Amino acid sequence: TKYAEGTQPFTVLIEGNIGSGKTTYLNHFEKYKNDICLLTEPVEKWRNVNGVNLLELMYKDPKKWAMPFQSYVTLTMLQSHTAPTNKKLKIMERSIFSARYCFVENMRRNGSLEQGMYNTLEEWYKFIEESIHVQADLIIYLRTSPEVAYERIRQRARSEESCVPLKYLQELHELHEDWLIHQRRPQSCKVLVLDAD
Amino acid sequence: TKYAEGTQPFTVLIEGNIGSGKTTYLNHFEKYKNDICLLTEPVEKWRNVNGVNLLELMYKDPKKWAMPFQSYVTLTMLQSHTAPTNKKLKIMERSIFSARYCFVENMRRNGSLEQGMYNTLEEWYKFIEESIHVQADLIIYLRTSPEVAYERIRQRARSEESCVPLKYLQELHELHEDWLIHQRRPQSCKVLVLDAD
Ligand SMILES: Cc1cn([C@H]2C[C@H](O)[C@@H](COP(=O)(O)OP(=O)(O)OP(=O)(O)O)O2)c(=O)[nH]c1=O
Ligand SMILES: Cc1cn([C@H]2C[C@H](O)[C@@H](COP(=O)(O)OP(=O)(O)OP(=O)(O)O)O2)c(=O)[nH]c1=O
Ligand SMILES: [Mg+2]
Ligand SMILES: [Mg+2]
Structure with a gap:
């Protein structure tokens, strides 16, 4: 019996490249705060971890900070995935799946994450899958061109x-394509593609 | 409810400095293995994470590797804490507590972990406490002098x-004292103190 198992409503994940308009799209749902659980703009957490800007540190020095930064992304996604709500609908910007399949994978390829750092993050993902319930009923994929992003x-x-x-x-665009259009990754629930160009 | 809640027998944790004799002490229970769940020598996992020696890397380059290493230590402890068993006694070498209260504390103090890395690990520790059940009924403290260790x-x-x-x-010795003797940390069930010199 996993943590948060059976505590979660129908859940929609808003996905897409950086600058694909995830927050903009979710902003239309805001007048409905009363009916829908909206967990938006998780980047604000990463820019201020009790005073520390992990986002800043990561971009300035990925070979040292990519690992702690991604581990913290993983955590905040988990917090949002497992957050209690009384509402019939939850919609989230991002998910543990994009952190894993796009960002972490890309940083492995470009060498920001050495094998040991990659392996540690991957072992965490595996344990999380057996121990923590991640509700996912629909992914809305805001598909964009890299130039537009x-x-x-x-x-x-x-x-x-x-x-x-x-x-x-x-690089990230193709990885979203691999995951959400070509089903190269294990994770599977309904995907609704939208043109955000 | 938390992951692994109500699944765990009376649990004993074996603690003490590096070289204090935790494994040696646990060896005495080897003949009772069919009735006691014995989880020993976790350092072997950390020396080989699919061929990567995280322990070695941490010691060669702590400013880079202490973070992912401590993150993996945390994971493996958690795997042992929550491992299923049908036996009425579990005994573990180390715990998530000593990794948090002794090693992470010391690595922060000596500057191996930057604030950002420290903050990430602590945010994890906080969430783990909310989400994952860690059974702890007794700690056996193999007290040593740093010189003997x-x-x-x-x-x-x-x-x-x-x-x-x-x-x-x-440095580690006084952090084990602070936790297990002076009790300047959160819980820690009863502590039985042994002279392992
Ligand atoms: C999810 C995630 C984001 N990031 C980074 C990429 C960006 O610099 C920043 C936020 O990226 P996004 O998660 O794509 O959020 P955004 O606000 O930029 O998206 P949108 O414009 O569509 O509203 O965090 C990672 O480095 N790793 C990750 O796993
Ligand atoms: C638990 C833990 C160990 N370590 C390191 C210290 C040691 O080099 C190595 C294993 O240490 P110990 O956990 O003390 O295990 P040990 O086998 O050396 O102890 P004993 O002789 O009593 O059986 O892992 C960390 O760096 N961080 C941690 O959180
Ligand atoms: Mg956004
Ligand atoms: Mg040992």
Whole structure:
């Protein structure tokens, strides 16, 4: 019997590249706060971990900070996945699955995460699967081109993202495609594709 | 309810400094193994995580590797704490508590863990406490002098531990005292103190 098992409503995960408009899309649901559990913009947690900006530290020095940063992403997603609600609907920006299948995998490929750091994160994912219930009934995938993602990133202008290269977003885009369109990853529930260009 | 709640027998934790004799002490129960769940020598997991020696890497480069290493230590302890058994007694070498209250404390103090890494591990520890059940009925404390621990470490001669100085063991000793003697930490059930010198 897993933690939070049987405590969760029908759950929708809002996914897509950085700057695909996940927060914008979820903002339309806000007037319905009373009926829907909305867990949005988890990045604010990562930018301020009791005063520490892990997002900043990660981009400045990935070979040292990518590991703690992803471990903390994993935690905050878990907190949101397992958060109690009395409501019939929960909608989340991001999920433990995108952290794992896109970000962690990409950082393994680019060498930000050495094998040992990758292995530790992966062993955690496996234990989490056996011990903690992650409700997932629908994923809405905001599909975008890397060029479009890139312009939104620049317009929003997060200081931490000011050095994010187009190639990185191309890498992440394909990984979202692998996961949500080509079913290269084990995880499976309904996916609704939307054009966010 | 938390993961593993109501699944665990009376649980004994064996604690003490590096080289204090936890495994040696647990060896005395080997003939009772069919009636006691015995989880010994977790360092063997940390020396080989699919071929990666996390212990070795932590000691060669703590500013980089102490974080992922402590994260994996935490995981493996948790795997042992929550492991199913039909036996009426469980005895474990180490616990999540000594990893948190002794090793992580010391690595933060000596600057092996930056605030960001420290904060990440602590946020995990907090969530684990909410989500995962850790059975703890007795701690047996194999109390040693740092000097004797040092001798035993040198005799055993783990290559990973070749550069461990007496000062490090003195530091850990006072953190074991702080927790198990002075009780300046949260719970810790009853403690039975043994002279392992
Ligand atoms: C989920 C996740 C985000 N990140 C980073 C990428 C971004 O710099 C930042 C937030 O990314 P996103 O999770 O994509 O959030 P966003 O607000 O940028 O998305 P949108 O514009 O569609 O609303 O965190 C990781 O490094 N690893 C991760 O696992
Ligand atoms: C539990 C723990 C151990 N360690 C390290 C210290 C040691 O080098 C190694 C194993 O230490 P110990 O957990 O003390 O195990 P041991 O086998 O050396 O003890 P004993 O001789 O009493 O049987 O792991 C950490 O770095 N962090 C931790 O949280
Ligand atoms: Mg957003
Ligand atoms: Mg031992």
